[PDB]
Design an enzyme around this catalytic site. Structure first.
Site, PDB file in Angstrom:
ATOM      1  N   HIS A  77       0.849  -1.192   0.000  1.00 22.13           N
ATOM      2  CA  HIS A  77       0.000   0.000   0.000  1.00 22.13           C
ATOM      3  C   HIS A  77       0.885   1.243   0.000  1.00 22.13           C
ATOM      4  CE1 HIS A  77      -3.030  -2.968   1.546  1.00 22.13           C
ATOM      5  NE2 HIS A  77      -3.769  -2.308   0.672  1.00 22.13           N
ATOM      6  N   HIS A  81       1.279   1.281  -5.837  1.00 21.11           N
ATOM      7  CA  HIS A  81      -0.049   0.680  -5.897  1.00 21.11           C
ATOM      8  C   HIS A  81      -1.087   1.693  -6.362  1.00 21.11           C
ATOM      9  CE1 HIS A  81      -3.875  -0.993  -4.877  1.00 21.11           C
ATOM     10  NE2 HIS A  81      -4.015  -0.242  -3.799  1.00 21.11           N
ATOM     11  N   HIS A 117      -6.706   6.968  -3.231  1.00 18.65           N
ATOM     12  CA  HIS A 117      -7.586   6.110  -2.443  1.00 18.65           C
ATOM     13  C   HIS A 117      -6.895   5.443  -1.258  1.00 18.65           C
ATOM     14  CE1 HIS A 117      -5.689   2.844  -4.756  1.00 18.65           C
ATOM     15  NE2 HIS A 117      -6.121   2.048  -3.794  1.00 18.65           N
ATOM     16  N   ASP A 118      -5.568   5.519  -1.151  1.00 15.54           N
ATOM     17  CA  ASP A 118      -4.852   4.857  -0.067  1.00 15.54           C
ATOM     18  C   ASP A 118      -3.800   5.769   0.552  1.00 15.54           C
ATOM     19  OD1 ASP A 118      -6.022   2.399   0.456  1.00 15.54           O
ATOM     20  OD2 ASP A 118      -4.943   1.383  -1.166  1.00 15.54           O
ATOM     21  N   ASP A 217      -8.521  -1.334  -8.142  1.00 13.46           N
ATOM     22  CA  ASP A 217      -7.818  -1.458  -6.869  1.00 13.46           C
ATOM     23  C   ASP A 217      -7.154  -2.824  -6.735  1.00 13.46           C
ATOM     24  OD1 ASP A 217      -6.885  -0.853  -4.340  1.00 13.46           O
ATOM     25  OD2 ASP A 217      -8.761  -1.369  -3.333  1.00 13.46           O
ATOM     26  N   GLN A 250      -4.157 -16.796  -2.599  1.00 15.95           N
ATOM     27  CA  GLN A 250      -4.495 -16.087  -3.829  1.00 15.95           C
ATOM     28  C   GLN A 250      -5.694 -16.725  -4.519  1.00 15.95           C
ATOM     29  OE1 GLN A 250      -3.024 -13.356  -2.974  1.00 15.95           O
ATOM     30  NE2 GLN A 250      -2.464 -12.904  -5.099  1.00 15.95           N
TER      31      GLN A 250
HETATM   32  O1  LIG Z   1      -5.544  -4.266  -0.606  1.00 10.11           O
HETATM   33  C1  LIG Z   1      -5.538  -4.436  -1.900  1.00 10.11           C
HETATM   34  O2  LIG Z   1      -5.772  -3.538  -2.700  1.00 10.11           O
HETATM   35  C2  LIG Z   1      -5.219  -5.822  -2.345  1.00 10.11           C
HETATM   36  C3  LIG Z   1      -4.696  -6.042  -3.618  1.00 10.11           C
HETATM   37  C4  LIG Z   1      -4.381  -7.325  -4.035  1.00 10.11           C
HETATM   38  C5  LIG Z   1      -4.586  -8.394  -3.184  1.00 10.11           C
HETATM   39  C6  LIG Z   1      -4.255  -9.771  -3.593  1.00 10.11           C
HETATM   40  O3  LIG Z   1      -3.780 -10.061  -4.691  1.00 10.11           O
HETATM   41  N1  LIG Z   1      -4.508 -10.736  -2.654  1.00 10.11           N
HETATM   42  C7  LIG Z   1      -5.032 -10.460  -1.419  1.00 10.11           C
HETATM   43  C8  LIG Z   1      -5.268 -11.615  -0.505  1.00 10.11           C
HETATM   44  C9  LIG Z   1      -4.087 -11.810   0.419  1.00 10.11           C
HETATM   45  C10 LIG Z   1      -4.137 -11.363   1.736  1.00 10.11           C
HETATM   46  C11 LIG Z   1      -3.054 -11.549   2.583  1.00 10.11           C
HETATM   47  C12 LIG Z   1      -1.912 -12.177   2.131  1.00 10.11           C
HETATM   48  C13 LIG Z   1      -1.867 -12.617   0.824  1.00 10.11           C
HETATM   49 CL1  LIG Z   1      -0.432 -13.403   0.235  1.00 10.11          CL
HETATM   50  C14 LIG Z   1      -2.938 -12.441  -0.030  1.00 10.11           C
HETATM   51  N2  LIG Z   1      -5.343  -9.234  -1.010  1.00 10.11           N
HETATM   52  C15 LIG Z   1      -5.117  -8.195  -1.899  1.00 10.11           C
HETATM   53  C16 LIG Z   1      -5.434  -6.891  -1.485  1.00 10.11           C
HETATM   54 MG   LIG Z   2      -7.280   0.790   0.612  1.00 11.60          MG
HETATM   55 ZN   LIG Z   3      -5.914   0.196  -2.652  1.00 10.21          ZN
END
Ligand SMILES: O=C(O)c1ccc2c(=O)[nH]c(Cc3cccc(Cl)c3)nc2c1
Ligand SMILES: [Mg+2]
Ligand SMILES: [Zn+2]
Length: 292
Positions: A77, A81, A117-118, A217, A250
């Site tokens: 973040h 991103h 947004h972040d 996002d 994932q």
């Molecule tokens: O916050 C975002 O914008 C964002 C963007 C991409 C992803 C993503 O690709 N996967 C995951 C699942 C996740 C959660 C924790 C650990 C692992 Cl390895 C994977 N969450 C994501 C979140």
């Molecule tokens: Mg966010």
């Molecule tokens: Zn974001």
């Protein structure tokens, strides 16, 4: 002030030279200044600079103010991103032909919200410092930069346009809360399933803008396999190391969140299929590694 001087005096290459129209765009080989020039091109090719009379040095200062209010010490973040989120918004408007379905003020707000947004994110495991609290903090940082002296890229708007833009920016940033996406995606899908989907309805349009921001996002899940592999490493670094199980996580994230979203986006505009196609290919590769 020395970074603003080299940015404001540089030449902005074409959109095709910067590859910002491809859904498979990656920022890895790019400097911080190169991403700032890509952001100028996105404002330029969307006619936002022309239709709203943005002065060059103010846009350069605003773009710079935004990237400095992201924290380098956060793995995912961060500014890269936010820059990638806005790039996919640009690609979804151009290559996805979504641009013709929206107004200039909606496009202007979507690009600003994607970049902002972040803002001031400190990592998912560093949220103790403090209904979408983080998203409200992100918009507060976005509005603060928009009002900073020398960074008022919206000064050329009327007071009527300025508030319409501000309220779309706020709703777009708040939509990036996956909690809000989960509670509203059911409605979004249930009208797709009945071909009732009508963007002339103001409630419908706001719902589509909310889903569109979530699509970009999480657009890193749709990237080519070598790119998504590296970004997933950045995500896992922030959620683990405060700064390995990944394939299983994932696939679950793709099943629960992304697949239907990108499926619904292609029903709205068939030319955003590369997003759904790229996310399916990543689910295939992550599942194969999940089986060791
Ligand atoms: O916050 C975002 O914008 C964002 C963007 C991409 C992803 C993503 O690709 N996967 C995951 C699942 C996740 C959660 C924790 C650990 C692992 Cl390895 C994977 N969450 C994501 C979140
Ligand atoms: Mg966010
Ligand atoms: Zn974001």
């Amino acid at each position: 002030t020395r970074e603003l001087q080299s940015l404001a005096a540089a030449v902005v290459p074409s959109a095709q030279t910067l590859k910002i129209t491809d859904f498979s765009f990656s920022d890895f080989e790019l400097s911080d200044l190169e991403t700032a020039l890509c952001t100028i091109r996105m404002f330029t090719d969307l006619n936002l600079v022309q239709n709203f009379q943005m002065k060059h040095e103010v846009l350069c200062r605003w773009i710079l103010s935004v990237k400095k209010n992201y924290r380098k010490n956060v793995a995912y973040h961060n500014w890269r991103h936010a820059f990638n989120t806005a790039q996919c918004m640009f690609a979804a408007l151009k290559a996805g032909k979504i641009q013709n379905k929206l107004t200039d003020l909606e496009i202007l707000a979507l690009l600003i919200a994607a970049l902002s947004h972040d803002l001031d994110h400190r990592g998912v495991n560093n949220s103790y410092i403090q209904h979408s609290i983080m998203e409200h903090h992100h918009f507060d940082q976005c509005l603060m930069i928009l009002n900073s002296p020398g960074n008022q890229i919206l000064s050329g708007l009327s007071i009527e346009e300025y508030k319409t833009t501000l309220k779309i920016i706020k709703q777009a940033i708040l939509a990036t809360d996956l909690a809000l996406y989960i509670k509203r995606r059911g409605e979004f899908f249930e009208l797709i399933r009945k071909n009732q989907f009508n963007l002339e309805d103001p409630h419908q349009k706001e719902l589509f803008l909310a889903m569109l921001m979530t699509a970009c996002d999480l657009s890193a899940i749709t990237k080519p396999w070598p790119i998504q592999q590296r970004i997933a490493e950045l995500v896992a670094t922030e959620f683990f190391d405060q700064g390995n199980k990944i394939p299983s996580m994932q696939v679950g994230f793709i099943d629960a969140i992304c697949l239907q979203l990108y499926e619904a986006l292609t029903h709205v505009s068939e030319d955003c299929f590369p997003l759904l196609d790229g996310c399916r290919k990543n689910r295939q590769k992550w599942q194969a590694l999940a089986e060791q």
